[PDB]
């Protein structure tokens, strides 16, 4: 939590460096939905994929996060973010606006930056959320406690390569299905694996829920990723 | 039940002349219908040409006179031996008393 | 301090010992119904008031303490010793047994060798007295280590004093009297002054004997002090 | 001066130097101890070395009566030994008050082991330079020996030894149980179990003992006691008229 | 202490007594028992002497803070839930706030007027019309009869006139007339001509 | 007296590593090999009882521990660190779960809790990470059987099968070959016994091997009859005798 | 031997020395000179005050503690304030609780113990001031020398500060003369004034230069400054 | 509780942590404040490492404190949030107890106070933030502009700038700001603000934003268009030989 | 690099010595004590022509009878002034009189001590010493007009005249000659102006230098720009003739 002669925050910079080695996560924002895609770091055949979660977490019913960094450090922050959402619902009888929750988590991170002599959390988040003030929203936060809003963004490994590709193929008027497609395509080319299989992927979407007028969160089942991997020409 | 207060009687009197003042009291200390003492002074020279009496409940009166005497001592320490003016004493005594607004010194005090 | 060196020793305790070795020399002698305490007071200047910078300390009414090293550390220790004696009496009514009092100082000193935020004590304390079953003498080193002694010595002249003590132990196996141990303590302090002698020194003796003091700690003054000084001045010439 | 040498943080090889140095410290007193189990008793023996002639030998012990039933022998410097002794007494009394039965040997061992484990993990506490051997006739387990070290390690033993010549005493005992083929000393009286223990201490150390070179603690059903010199002397006389 | 609230079709109207009485004297005949919580939310209050203004002003501060922090006005429903939780906390503390409130607001997101009645225990309920204390014993029945869910604001003001008239006939104490205030899509205004109308 | 190290002893280095965590894993490496295998009707966890001198009583050391009547744990790394984690884990299963919901936690959530205790030691002032890696095996009504690994960082992941410690790399390979998703429990035990024969030098028998299952409910291990609505704990420590019997037909 | 062992007070050096305590002692050397001496009926403090500029005060160096007790400082002045303040409270406690004037010797033990704790606590520094303590109690006149190491000693006379050794040498030899100045205040003050001279390359001692304090049998602790010290130059 | 002192003095008499905080400020994007005859104008720049942002939701640089006072900053963003929140609370708290909105001077003195406190407390680092605070005192019309820095120093400015290449824009402002005649209108005050930013930013596209404050809580943010209208005018008008 | 309250082998506290170096880097403050009043003068030193010069508060009122000029890291003086104003007001509340100037200074110097790593003080809530010195001037019935220099060490000194800041070595030597025990108030004001003019980096005018005094009869007044500009216009003319 000390300053460099240059005016940077040593431990923060080093935490970002840590994140740059973690499995890539991508957020893409459509006109009618948000996509979350994330890649599991060099795994094995015996690793259970069914009962596994490591990169995509449900925060409440209208907001989810993609994790890049220390799994455990994220579990801590996830759980207090889950509590903050419930506190807000209790106080106001309304679900928490996506930004407000994001600001709160970013403030917690900022704390470990300014006081207390404890190490920052080695965690970056992509927040996908919906609320009735701003519609669909995609946010990013990192160890420095800084947060920004995005049309498409990536965190973790190879963000330079990933960012270039997203800038190339993204356009404001996309549908969720094309965003899903774009998400996989980007990860296909920034992987450190031979190819991209189903068991190395986590996938989630925040849609307007087929037919209702209500918002739906879908954490893609193993088999469902395998399916979505076929149609888009990757098998 | 325990009653923290008592009444030791006595009567004090203060009269201010042009260039002098007097504070007087009886020397009798009592409990109910008994005499505890026929000579128990309750008017005190407090230094800095101030005389004080805290009449009523004698235990409370003594605590107060003690604390004011000491208040004078520390005034001298903290304020380069300056004489405590009678008005400054009075104000200081207000603060002493009000310090115990919610568990008072059961005394009528004159300086 | 909370630091072992690779040999298993504690280098901060070890350096404390050095400060002790640097101090004035002080002794204890156990006698057949009591204990005697003695210390070397360096006269830095003629300006010191004689008899008036008392180094021996009483704990409760029956325990004496003397120390060598950093005097403040010794005093700090006795203040704790006094609270520890008061606390035992308060709860158990009886005054504190000596072995019990030794461990109370023991554990306290030892605690100051456990954390890096505290430093060990720069004193070795000799202390003892008479409890419900006899006389006891103890010496406690900066590490918290202590044992019972027949005789004890610490400070600059510890070797020469320890030698004399061994001679006494070996040549009086039947026991030594309170009067005798007082005279001998005076001898041993004079003999110990050899290794710290660029300065003049004042003697100080205390005792706690079942018969000579009714089991209470007293300073040796007047006739009995001068008689001891004489005995020493005689057997040094 | 690397920090991983001064406080209990890991070294690159996943090591804790302070703990290692604490183990070194346990040998500082140059004393060996051993414990064995009888049919219905448990015996601890330790060398007693009184070098200084000025010392009162009666006050020089490394054996502690923790409760009515549990005895403890320490290998390591005395101040740390007494620290762990006072604590174990405290803990044994507290157990009885809260739970209404006597703290068992193995549980107190575990509790002290956990305490030591804490110093292993927290930076402001140094480990204690000691190995603690706990002994009793447990009301459920029978004759018991449990031993803890500065790492926070503890285990139960058929028999055991500690000190500079630990290894020689161990193999000596190992070899005895290999032949006798049982996990105890098949002897009715505790006196003969002590005699056994001393005998095997002698063979492994290559030394003769007088009464003032030893310290014996015995643990029987509902009592742990230490032996006086004259009790030891009578034991020494009995080994003399056979061996 | 009269605290009345009526929710018509396009607005909410609050009427609050103007008297402040300490012991044997009426100290003021022009008291505004009301704080504005946001451009489209109004709170009326009655209860124990000190707590009354302290509570309202504290609620006001918090809502204003929220507003500036998000550059966004909280819904009546949300504002009222905040207020309820506050009282619900308070009721079990060392010295509870003894204050009853009505919250009237216009929800711009829904284009609906809303009236909330909350007592000092933190009992919240949404109502077509509401009151606190004795005033309800007279009004509720009068409003049960004359009230319609689709009245204009002008009609709601005639309904209150009937309520105040009844209270002036049958209440023992002189509450020195009411201040009336409307909350609609345009905000909060005061009908400062109700007393001699 | 009082803690003077109120800062993290585990901090990021310029390259992005967390030093003390790495070194904790290095400590885990030197640890004795241990493994878990998930079957269709059970889970097996097993390890070696490396006895320090045959005078030590192997049974008196718990390397495999019951955490809840349906959950067990085994470790590699530092025994003392494991022992305290077991106690804290047992207690937290009660204070955070059973005392609230009146039922023992599901496997994934107890693991989540242990992971928290471990993460905290990764970040709190004046502490070093735990020098262990755990394998936690259990059953719960809604998730069935599961197996998890918890590392010094507080990271955890589920495995169909795995091994940790000394001969881990080699054993992961051995398991990969022998694991299929149709294994009965007795098959998994057999596979575990085989996998563990690679790591061990000297004697290899029931008195040097600790092995526990999470299987069927054991009604006679419950302690009481009369509430037919639990047939007991699913956790069972295999006896020295039971191991040797599966070694003869090995 | 001198390197990494002067970090804090919680560190002993391999010699067995506490360097932070030793460096604190050094602050005294750099402090202005002060003298203390007593007979059997009185005790006197003579302190030479030191000006920062020709336009400045000669900083007070004598602090009154009770009606029967007081002290003179050399070193960090703020530290003299903390300790004399503590001494005021202790004299005060003794008076209120026990109606007993605090024995000078006990005041010594109390200062020793307060200073000691700062030679053993991490994150705290030793005191950086020496103090001379005079008093008249139930056993007569007393003088004490306080050192921030915690070491306190009772003496007939002494001096601390810049070139103190001169005054201390003089007093070591004048011993049997001044001790017999009984019932003669001004002659004891004179012996004090003459004692402070043997420590002055500086110059003459002027009106604002000099500060004297006295306490005796029927004399409460009084400080004399300037005008009333002129008769001693 | 960790209270190990981070901000200490160096031999030359400098608090290095405070010093390196200024370095973080100079690293941050530029901000300018210029005050007119009946207004104050604040202007900011935006970086260019990425350009796939969602500007609808992304935290704008000029923050509202109360309805009549605004705060802009150069330095660490995450730090500025913490100052802004605290300033917003104090604003409300002052209304609650003095029955009056804060003066601009007071709000400044408070933020500068919080910044100072963080230069002398155990286990905390100074704010890598320096601020411009602008607006009008309640029921007053004389325009106010102030600046605070990580040390806690604060003062008022006819015009001022902070952040990267502030040196150059302060260079510009010193030439073109006449004390005798402040930019008499909203319009001619926004012009001097846009000019002064152009030296540093490059294209006046999605990189320059402006905010105007008049008396009695009148605060309007300009759009890309209305800014582009100043960008287009100055580049064409001020090119000729 | 070791600690915050550590001693050098010379017997000085490092941090205290280094704070004094910070004060040397500060703007000049001058105080002159007479028998008709005490004058305090400061150098504004705006780092830019755009800084509004009268928002430079380097002379502050403490009570009606006590004023204060600062030098160094002036933001550190905020809490000292706060503490002084409180101590002065509080004293009036407890004693129905004015605080003595010495007592007020001593109270500020107490605040200045409270620096340490949660030290064996109590608690010492403050990590470093103050980067600012203060000239405290005022009047009381007992000791009349008084000037004080209060360093971040916790030591204070009474002066007839004093200069602190960058120009202090040269200014103090000039004060040595010019000060006599019969200086009128008007004479003293001119001397402050003169000495400031010498040591200031800029040319002295009413915008970049501030004058103030405390008189028994009018208390602490800050001289507004127009009244000071006249004293300058009166100095240049006084020193034209000589």
Domains of chain D: 1-243 (3.60.20.10)
CA–CA distance, I160 with I139 (Å, rounded to integer): 13
Which CB contacts under 8 angstroms, 24+ apart, belong to B67-75? B67/B96, B68/B92, B68/B93, B68/B96, B69/B44, B70/G92, B70/G96, B71/B96, B72/B46, B72/B47, B72/B48, B73/B47, B73/G92
| Backbone CA torsion sign across F175, F177, F178, F183 | positive
Shortest CA gap I97–chain B (Å): 7
Q: What is the CA radius of gyration of chain G?
A: 18
E81 → closest Cβ in A91, A97, A133? A91
Of C16, C20, C45, the CB nearest to G172: C45
| Cross-chain residue pair A90–E109, CB shorter than 8 Å | no
Q: Rounded distance, CA H165 to CA H26, Å?
A: 7
Q: Which residues are CB-neighbours of D6 under 8 A, at least 6 positions away?
A: C3, D18
Q: Report the CATH number of the A1-235 domain.
A: 3.60.20.10
Candidates G1, G2, G16, partner chain C, best to mutate (most C CBs within 10 A): G16
- CA distances E68 to E71, E73, E83, H69, I196, Å, are 5, 9, 18, 11, 47
Which residues have a Cβ under 8 Å from the Cβ of G186 and sit 6 or more positions away? G232
User: Which of I162, I160, I148, I145 minimizes the C-alpha distance to I220?
Assistant: I145
Running DSSP on this structure, what letter comes out for residue G231?
G
CA distance A108 to H97: 30
Domain range summary for chain I, segments of one domain joined by +: 1-242
CA E89 to chain centroid, in Å, comes to 21
Map out the domains of chain E with their CATH numbers: 1-197 (3.60.20.10)
CA distances from I31 to D226, E45, G58, I79, I187 (A): 83, 59, 18, 22, 13
E99-107: strand order across its sheet: E34-38, E41-47, E99-107, E112-118, E124-126
Per-window interface: D 71-110 vs C, CB < 8 A: 77-80, 82-83, 86
Q: What are the residue boundaries of the structural domains of chain A, listed by start?
A: 1-235
How would you classify residue C177: left for phi > 0, otherwise alpha for psi between -120 and 50, otherwise beta? beta
Query: Residues H114, H86: contact at Cβ < 8 Å?
Result: yes
Q: For chain F, which domains are there?
A: 1-250 (3.60.20.10)
Do residues D162 and D131 lie in contact, with contact meaning Cβ atoms separated by under 8 Å?
Answer: yes
In this structure, are residues I68 and I59 in contact, taking their beta carbons and an 8 Å threshold?
yes
Q: Measured between CB atoms, which of A6, A149, A167 is closest to H58? A: A149
Active site residues of C: 24
Can you give the residue range of the structural domain that contains G204?
1-233
Contact in structure between I210 and I229 (CB atoms under 8 Å): no
Contact I11 G118 (CB under 8 A): no
The per-type count for chain D, helices as H runs and strands as E runs, is 6, 10
Q: Please tell me whether residue D79 adopts helix, strand or coil conformation.
A: helix
DSSP E101-156: EEEEEEETTTTEEEEEEE-TT--EEE-SEEEETTHHHHHHHHHHHH--TT--HHHH
The conformational region for residue E60 under phi > 0 = left, psi -120 to 50 = alpha, else beta, is alpha
Closest by Cα among G145, G160, G158, G155 to G107 = G145
Q: Give the rounded distance of the alpha carbon of A71 from its chain centre.
A: 13
Q: Starting from the edge strand earliest in sequence, which strands make up the sheet with H129-135, in order?
A: H63-66, H69-75, H129-135, H144-148, H154-156
CA F104 to chain centre: 18
As a whole number of angstroms, the distance between CA F36 and CA F39 comes to: 10
Q: To 5 degrees, how large is the angle CA H217–CA H222–CA H224?
A: 165
F153 contacts in chain D (CB < 8 Å): none
**Bridge partners of residue A140, in order along the sequence:** A126, A148
| Given resolution (angstroms) | 2.8
Q: Report whether H74 contacts H166 (CB < 8 A).
A: yes
CB distance A3 to H125 below 8 Å: yes
Burial (CB < 10 A; 0-12, 13-18, 19+), residue A171, is: exposed
Determine, for residues A11 and F175 on separate chains, whether the beta-carbon distance falls below 8 Å.
Answer: no
Closest to A77 in 3D by CA, of A22, A123, A39, A17: A123
- Identify each DSSP E strand in G17-101 by its residue range: 34-38, 42-48, 62-64, 69-75
Q: Are F158 and F146 in contact (CB under 8 A)?
A: yes
Compute the C-alpha angle H163/H165/H166, nearest 5°: 55
Q: Three-class SS string for chain I?
A: CCCCCCECCCCCEHHHHHHHHHHHCCCCEEEEECCCCEEEEEECCCCCCCECHHHCCCEEEEECCEEEEEEECHHHHHHHHHHHHHHHHHHHHHHCCCCCHHHHHHHHHHHHHCCEECCCCCCCEECCCCCEEEEEEEEECCCEEEEEEECCCCCEEEECEEEECCCHHHHHHHHHHHCCCCCCHHHHHHHHHHHHHHHCCCCCCCCCEEEEEEECCCEEEECCHHHHHHHHHHHHHHCCCC
* Alpha carbon distance I122, I120 (integer Å): 6
CA distance H56 to H71: 20
Q: I209 forms bridges with which residues in the sheet?
A: I43
The full set of domains in chain C, from first to last, is: 1-237 (3.60.20.10)
Minimum CA–CA partner of G5 in chain I: I2
Distances (CA, A) of F85 to E161, F71, H206: 73, 14, 55
CA dihedral I46, I50, I54, I58 (to 10 degrees): -30
Q: Are D144 and D137 in contact (CB under 8 A)?
A: yes
Fold for the domain defined by H1-241: 3.60.20
Q: How far apart are CA C88 and CA C93, in angstroms?
A: 8
Give yes or no for a contact between F92 and F104, defined as CB atoms under 8 angstroms apart.
no
Closest residue in G to B78 (Cα–Cα): G85
Residue D108: strand, helix, or coil: helix
Q: Are I210 and I53 in contact (CB under 8 A)?
A: no
Chains F and B touch (3+ CB pairs under 8 A): no
Asked if residues D71 and D41 have their Cβ atoms less than 8 Å apart, the reply is: no
d(CA I213, CA I189): 9
Residue pair C124/C140 in contact by the 8 Å Cβ criterion: yes
Nearest to F48 by CA among F74, F82, F78, F68: F74
Do the Cβ atoms of C62 and C68 come closer than 8 Å?
Answer: no
CA end-to-end span of chain I: 54
Q: Give the chain H residue whose CA is nearest to the CA of E70.
A: H64
Judged by CB atoms closer than 8 Å, whether chains meet at H5 and I22 is answered as no
CATH number, domain I1-242: 3.60.20.10
Q: Which H or E run includes A18?
A: helix A10-19
Q: In this structure, how many other beta carbons lie within 10 angstroms of the beta carbon of residue H158?
A: 20
Q: In this structure, how many other beta carbons lie within 10 angstroms of the beta carbon of residue C91?
A: 8
Dihedral sign (CA D5, D9, D10, D12): negative
* I71 interfaces chain H, CB cutoff of 8 Å: no
Distance of CA F38 to the CA centre of its chain: 13
Distance (Å) from the alpha carbon of C107 to chain F's nearest alpha carbon: 13
Phi/psi at I9 (nearest 5 deg)? Answer: -60, -20
Distance of CA D24 to the CA centre of its chain: 16
I-chain residues within 8 Å CB-CB of H121? 126-127
The answer to whether A14 contacts chain F (CB < 8 Å) is yes
Helical segments of chain H, H only: 16-27, 77-98, 104-117, 166-176, 186-201, 224-237
Q: Rounded to 5 degrees, what are φ and ψ at I10?
A: -80, -15
Those residues whose C-beta lies under 8 Å from the C-beta of residue D2, and which sit 6 or more positions away, are none
Closest CA to C211 of C117, C134, C114: C134
- DSSP-derived pairing of the beta strands D71-75 and D159-162: unpaired
CB contact under 8 A, C119 and G13: no
State the Cα–Cα distance between residues G96 and I239, nearest whole angstrom: 65
Q: Give the Cα-Cα-Cα angle A211, A216, A221 (nearest 5 degrees).
A: 110
Of the candidates G154, G192, G158, G152, the one whose C-alpha atom is nearest the C-alpha of residue G172 is G158
Q: Taken in order F56, F58, F64, F68, is the CA torsion positive or negative?
A: negative
Rounded CA gap, C165 and C185, in Å?
9
Q: How far apart are the first and last CA of chain C?
A: 46
Contact H4 F125 (CB under 8 A): no
CA distance F156 to F158: 7
**Which has the closest alpha carbon to I151: H6, H121, H150, G52?**
G52
Handedness of CA D106, D112, D113, D118 (dihedral sign): positive
Collapsing DSSP states into helix, strand and coil, what is residue A19? helix
Neighbouring residues of E90: CB distance < 8 A, sequence distance ≥ 6: E96, E97, E120, E122
Q: CA-nearest residue of chain H to F4? A: H2
Q: How far apart are the first and last CA of chain H?
A: 66
Contacts of D240 (CB under 8 A, 6+ apart): none
What are the residues facing E4 on neighbouring strands?
E15, E131
Which residues are E13's β-sheet partners?
E6, E182
Q: Cβ of D3 under 8 Å from any chain C Cβ?
A: no
Q: Which residues of F touch C (CB under 8 A)?
A: 1-2, 4
Work out the burial of residue A214: count CB atoms within 10 Å of its CB; fewer than 13 is exposed, 13-18 middle, 19 or more buried.
exposed
| Cβ neighbours for E51, distance < 8 A, ≥ 6 positions apart | E97, E98, E99
Question: What are the angstrom distances between the C-alpha of F30 and each of F26, F64, G79?
Answer: 7, 18, 56
Which chains neighbour G (Cβ–Cβ under 8 Å, 3 or more pairs)?
A: B, C, I
Number of residues assigned to chain F:
250
Sheet of H31-35, strand order: H159-162, H31-35, H40-45, H208-214, H218-221
> Got the DSSP string for D169-238?
HHHHHHHHHHHH-SSSB--SSHHHHHHHHHHHHHHHHT----GGGEEEEEEETTEEEEPPHHHHHHHHHH
For residue C195, what is the DSSP state? G
Shortest distance, CA E47 to any CA of chain A (angstroms): 24
What is d(CA I179, CA I95) in angstroms, rounded to the nearest whole number? Answer: 36
Taking the CA of residue E15 and the nearest CA in chain A, the distance in Å comes to 26
Whole-angstrom CA distances from G129 to D106, G81, G98 are 56, 10, 30
User: Which domain CATH number covers G162?
Assistant: 3.60.20.10
Task: Spell out the long-range contacts of E151-158 with Cβ–Cβ below 8 A and sequence spacing 24 or more.
Answer: E151/E8, E151/E9, E152/E8, E152/E9, E152/E10, E153/E8, E153/E10, E153/E11, E153/E13, E153/E182, E153/E184, E155/E8, E156/E6, E156/E8, E156/E11, E156/E13, E157/E13, E157/E191
Interface of A with E (CB under 8 A): 90-94, 97, 100, 132-133
Rg for chain I, CA atoms, rounded: 18
Domain spans of chain H? 1-241
Q: Would you say G25 and G31 are in contact if contact means Cβ atoms under 8 Å apart?
A: no
Q: What is the DSSP letter of F159?
A: B
């Amino acid at each position: 939590t000390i300053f460099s002669p240059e005016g940077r925050l040593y431990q923060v910079e080093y935490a970002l460096e840590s994140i740059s080695h973690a499995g890539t996560a991508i957020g893409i924002m459509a006109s009618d939905g948000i996509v979350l895609a994330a890649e599991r770091k060099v795994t094995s055949t015996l690793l259970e994929q069914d009962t596994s979660t490591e990169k995509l977490y449900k925060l409440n019913d209208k907001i989810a996060v993609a994790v890049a960094g220390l799994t455990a450090d994220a579990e801590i922050l996830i759980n207090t973010a889950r509590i903050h959402a419930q506190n807000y619902l209790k106080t106001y009888n309304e679900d928490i606006p996506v930004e407000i929750l994001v600001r709160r988590l970013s403030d917690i991170k900022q704390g470990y930056t300014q006081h207390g002599g404890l190490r920052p959390f080695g965690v970056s988040f992509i927040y996908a959320g919906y609320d009735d003030r701003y519609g669909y929203q995609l946010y990013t936060s990192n160890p420095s406690g800084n947060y920004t809003g995005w049309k498409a963004i990536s965190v973790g490994a190879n963000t330079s390569a990933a960012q270039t590709l997203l800038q190339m193929d993204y356009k404001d008027d996309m549908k969720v299905d094309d965003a899903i497609e774009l998400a996989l395509k980007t990860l296909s080319k920034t992987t450190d694996s031979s190819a991209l299989t189903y068991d190395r992927l986590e996938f989630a979407t925040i849609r307007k829920g087929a037919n209702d007028g209500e918002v739906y969160q879908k954490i893609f089942k193993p088999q469902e990723i395998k399916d979505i991997l076929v149609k888009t020409g990757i098998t | 039940q325990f009653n923290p207060y008592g009444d030791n009687g006595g009567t004090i009197l203060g009269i201010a002349g042009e260039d002098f003042a007097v504070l007087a009291g009886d020397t009798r200390n009592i409990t109910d219908y008994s005499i505890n003492s026929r000579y128990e002074p309750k008017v005190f020279d407090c230094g800095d040409n101030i005389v004080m009496s805290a009449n009523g409940f004698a235990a409370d009166g003594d605590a107060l006179v003690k604390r004011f005497k000491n208040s004078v001592k520390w005034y001298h320490f903290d304020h380069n031996d300056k004489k405590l003016s009678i008005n400054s004493a009075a104000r200081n005594i207000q603060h002493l008393l009000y310090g115990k607004r919610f568990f008072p010194y059961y005394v009528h005090t004159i300086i | 301090n909370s630091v072992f060196s690779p040999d298993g020793r504690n280098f901060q305790v070890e350096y404390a010992v050095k400060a002790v070795e640097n101090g004035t020399t002080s002794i204890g002698i156990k006698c057949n119904d009591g204990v005697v305490f003695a210390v070397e007071k360096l006269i830095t200047s003629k300006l010191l008031v004689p008899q008036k910078n008392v180094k021996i300390q009483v704990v409760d009414r029956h325990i004496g303490c003397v120390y060598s090293g950093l005097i403040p550390d010794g005093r700090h220790l006795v203040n704790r010793g006094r609270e520890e004696a008061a606390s035992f009496k308060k709860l158990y009514k009886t005054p504190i047994p000596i072995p019990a009092f030794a461990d109370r100082l023991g554990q306290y000193v030892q605690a100051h060798t456990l954390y890096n935020s505290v430093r060990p004590f720069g004193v070795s304390t000799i202390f003892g007295g008479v409890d419900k079953n006899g006389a006891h003498l103890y010496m406690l080193e900066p590490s918290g280590s202590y044992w019972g002694y027949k005789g004890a010595a610490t400070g600059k002249g510890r070797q020469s004093a320890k030698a004399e003590l061994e001679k006494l132990v070996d040549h009086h196996p039947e026991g030594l009297s309170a009067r005798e141990a007082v005279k001998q303590a005076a001898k041993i302090i004079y003999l110990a002054h050899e290794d710290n002698k660029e300065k003049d020194f004042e003697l100080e003796i205390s005792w706690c004997s079942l018969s000579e003091t009714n089991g209470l700690h007293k300073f040796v003054k007047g006739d009995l002090l001068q008689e001891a000084i004489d005995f020493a001045q005689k057997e040094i010439n | 001066a690397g920090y991983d040498r001064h406080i209990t943080i890991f070294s690159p090889e996943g090591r804790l130097y302070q703990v290692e140095y604490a183990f070194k410290a346990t040998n500082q007193t140059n004393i060996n101890s051993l414990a064995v189990r009888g049919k219905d008793c448990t015996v601890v023996i330790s060398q007693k070395k009184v070098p200084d002639k000025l010392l009162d030998p009666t006050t020089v012990s490394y054996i502690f009566c923790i409760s009515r039933t549990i005895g403890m022998v320490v290998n390591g410097p005395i101040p740390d030994a007494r620290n762990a002794a006072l604590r174990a007494k405290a803990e044994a009394a507290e157990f009885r008050y809260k739970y209404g039965y006597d703290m068992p040997c193995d549980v107190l061992a575990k509790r002290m082991a956990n305490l030591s484990q804490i110093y292993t993990q927290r930076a402001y506490m140094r480990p204690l330079g000691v190995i603690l051997t706990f002994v009793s006739v447990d009301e459920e387990l029978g004759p018991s020996i449990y031993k803890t070290d500065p790492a926070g390690y503890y285990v139960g033993y058929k028999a055991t030894a500690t000190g500079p010549k630990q290894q020689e005493i161990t193999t000596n005992l190992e070899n005895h149980f290999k032949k006798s083929k049982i996990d105890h000393i098949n002897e009715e009286s505790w006196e003969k179990v002590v005699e056994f223990a001393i005998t095997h201490m002698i063979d492994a150390l290559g030394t003769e003992f007088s009464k003032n070179d030893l310290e014996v603690g015995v643990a029987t059903k509902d009592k742990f006691f230490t032996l006086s010199a004259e009790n030891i002397e009578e034991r020494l006389v009995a080994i003399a008229e056979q061996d | 202490d009269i605290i009345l609230g009526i929710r018509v079709q396009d607005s909410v109207i609050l009427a609050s007594s103007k008297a402040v009485t300490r012991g044997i004297s009426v100290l003021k005949d022009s008291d505004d028992k009301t704080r504005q919580l946001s451009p489209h939310t109004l709170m009326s209050f009655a209860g124990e002497a000190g707590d009354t203004v302290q509570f309202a002003e504290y609620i006001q501060a918090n809502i204003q803070l929220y507003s500036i922090r998000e550059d966004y006005e909280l819904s009546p429903q949300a504002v009222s839930s905040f207020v309820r939780q506050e009282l619900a906390k308070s009721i079990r503390s060392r010295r509870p706030y003894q204050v009853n409130v009505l919250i009237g607001g216009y929800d711009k997101k829904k284009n609906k007027p809303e009236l909330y009645q909350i007592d000092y225990l933190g009992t919240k309920v949404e109502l077509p019309y509401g009151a606190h204390g004795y005033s309800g014993f007279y009004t509720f029945s009068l409003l049960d009869h004359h009230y319609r869910p689709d009245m204009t604001t002008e009609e709601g003001l005639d309904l209150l006139k009937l309520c105040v008239q009844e209270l002036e006939k049958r209440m023992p104490m002189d509450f020195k007339g009411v201040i009336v205030k409307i909350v609609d899509k345009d905000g909060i205004r005061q009908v400062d001509d109700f007393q001699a109308q | 007296m009082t803690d003077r190290y109120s800062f993290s002893l585990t901090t990021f280095s310029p390259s992005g590593k967390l030093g003390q965590i790495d070194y904790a894993l290095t400590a885990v490496k030197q640890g004795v090999t241990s493994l878990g295998i998930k079957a269709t009707n059970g889970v097996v966890i097993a390890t070696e009882k490396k006895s320090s001198s045959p005078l030590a009583m192997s049974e008196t050391l718990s390397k495999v521990s019951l955490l809840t009547p349906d959950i067990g744990a085994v470790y590699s790394g530092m025994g003392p660190d494991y022992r305290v984690l077991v106690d804290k884990s047992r207690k937290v299963a009660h204070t955070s779960y059973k005392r609230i919901y009146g039922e023992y936690p599901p496997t994934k959530l107890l693991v989540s809790e242990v992971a928290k205790i471990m993460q905290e030691a990764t970040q709190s002032g004046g502490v070093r990470p735990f020098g262990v890696s755990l394998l936690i095996a259990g059953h719960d009504e809604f998730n069935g059987f599961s197996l998890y690994q918890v590392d010094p960082s507080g990271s955890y992941f589920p495995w169909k099968a795995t091994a940790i410690g000394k001969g881990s790399v080699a054993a992961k390979t051995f398991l990969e070959k022998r694991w299929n998703d149709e294994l009965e429990l007795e098959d998994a035990i057999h596979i575990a016994l085989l996998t563990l024969k690679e790591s061990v030098e000297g004697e290899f028998n029931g008195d040097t091997i600790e092995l526990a299952i999470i299987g069927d409910e054991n009604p006679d291990l419950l302690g009481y009859t009369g509430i037919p609505t639990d047939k007991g704990p699913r956790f069972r420590k295999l006896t020295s005798q039971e191991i040797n019997d599966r070694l003869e037909a090995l | 031997f001198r390197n990494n062992y002067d970090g804090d007070t919680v560190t002993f050096s391999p010699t067995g020395r506490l360097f932070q305590v030793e460096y604190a002692l050094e602050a005294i050397k750099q402090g202005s000179v002060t003298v203390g001496l007593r007979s059997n009926t009185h005790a006197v403090l003579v302190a030479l005050k030191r000006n920062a500029d020709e336009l400045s005060s000669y900083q007070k160096k004598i602090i009154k503690c009770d009606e029967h007790m007081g002290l003179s400082l050399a070193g960090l002045a703020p530290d003299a304030r903390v300790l004399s303040n503590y001494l005021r409270q202790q004299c005060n406690y003794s008076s209120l609780v026990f109606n007993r004037k605090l024995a000078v010797e006990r005041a010594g033990h109390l200062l020793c113990d307060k200073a000691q704790k700062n030679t053993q606590s991490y994150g705290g520094r030793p005191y950086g001031v020496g103090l001379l303590i005079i008093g008249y109690d139930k056993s007569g006149a007393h003088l004490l020398e306080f050192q921030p190491s915690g070491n306190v000693t009772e003496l007939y006379g002494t001096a601390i500060g810049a070139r103190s050794q001169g005054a201390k040498t003089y007093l070591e030899r004048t011993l049997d003369t001044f001790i017999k100045i009984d019932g003669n205040p001004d002659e004891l003050i004179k012996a004090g004034v003459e004692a402070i001279s043997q420590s002055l390359r500086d110059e003459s001692l002027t009106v604002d230069n000099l500060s004297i304090a006295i306490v005796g049998k029927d004399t409460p602790f009084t400080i004399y400054d300037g005008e009333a010290v002129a008769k001693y130059i | 509780g960790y209270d190990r002192a981070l901000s200490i003095f160096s031999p030359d008499g400098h608090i290095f942590q405070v010093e390196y905080a200024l370095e973080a400020v100079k690293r941050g994007t530029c901000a300018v404040g210029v005050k007119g005859k009946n207004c104050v104008v604040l202007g900011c720049e935006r970086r260019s490492t990425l350009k796939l942002q969602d500007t609808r939701i992304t935290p704008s640089k000029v923050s509202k404190i109360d309805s009549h006072v605004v705060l802009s900053f150069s330095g660490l963003n995450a730090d500025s949030r913490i100052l802004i929140e605290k300033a917003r609370v104090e604003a409300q708290s002052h209304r609650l107890t003095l029955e009056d909105p804060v003066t601009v001077e007071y709000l400044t003195r408070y933020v500068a106070g919080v910044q100072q406190r963080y230069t002398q407390s155990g286990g905390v680092r100074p704010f890598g933030v320096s601020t411009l605070i602008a607006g009008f005192d309640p029921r007053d019309d004389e325009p106010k502009l102030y600046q605070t820095e990580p040390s806690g120093i604060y003062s008022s400015w006819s015009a001022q700038t902070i952040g990267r290449n502030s040196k150059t824009v302060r260079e510009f402002l010193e030439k073109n700001y006449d004390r005798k005649e402040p930019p008499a209108t909203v319009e001619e005050c926004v012009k001097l603000t846009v000019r002064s930013l152009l030296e540093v930013v490059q294209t006046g596209a999605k990189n320059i934003e402006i905010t105007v404050v008049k008396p009695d809580s009148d605060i309007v943010a300009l759009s890309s268009e209305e800014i582009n209208q100043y960008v287009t005018q100055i580049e064409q008008e001020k090119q000729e030989q | 690099d070791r600690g915050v309250s550590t001693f050098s082998p010379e017997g000085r506290l490092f941090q205290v010595e280094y704070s004094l170096e910070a004060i040397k880097l500060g703007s000049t403050a001058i105080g002159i004590a007479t028998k008709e009043g005490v004058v305090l003068g400061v150098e504004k030193r705006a780092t830019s022509p755009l800084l509004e010069s009268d928002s430079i508060e380097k002379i502050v009122e403490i009570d009606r009878h006590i004023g204060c000029a600062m030098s160094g890291l002036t933001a550190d003086a905020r809490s000292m002034i706060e503490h002084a104003r409180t101590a002065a007001v509080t004293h009036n509340l407890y004693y129905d009189e004015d605080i003595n100037v010495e007592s007020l200074t001593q109270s500020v110097c107490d605040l200045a001590l409270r620096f340490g790593e949660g030290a064996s003080g109590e608690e010492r809530l403050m990590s470093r010493p103050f980067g600012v010195a203060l000239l405290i001037a005022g009047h009381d019935a007992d000791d009349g007009y008084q000037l004080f220099h209060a360093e971040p060490s916790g030591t204070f000194y009474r002066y007839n005249a004093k200069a602190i800041g960058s120009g202090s070595e040269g200014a103090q030597a000039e004060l040595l000659n010019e000060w006599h025990s019969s200086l009128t108030l008007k004479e003293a004001e001119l001397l402050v102006l003169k000495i400031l003019k010498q040591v200031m980096e800029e040319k002295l005018d009413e915008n970049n230098a501030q004058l103030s005094c405390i008189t028994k009869q009018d208390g602490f007044k800050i001289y507004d720009n127009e009244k000071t500009a006249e004293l300058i216009k009166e100095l240049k003319e006084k020193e034209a003739a000589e």
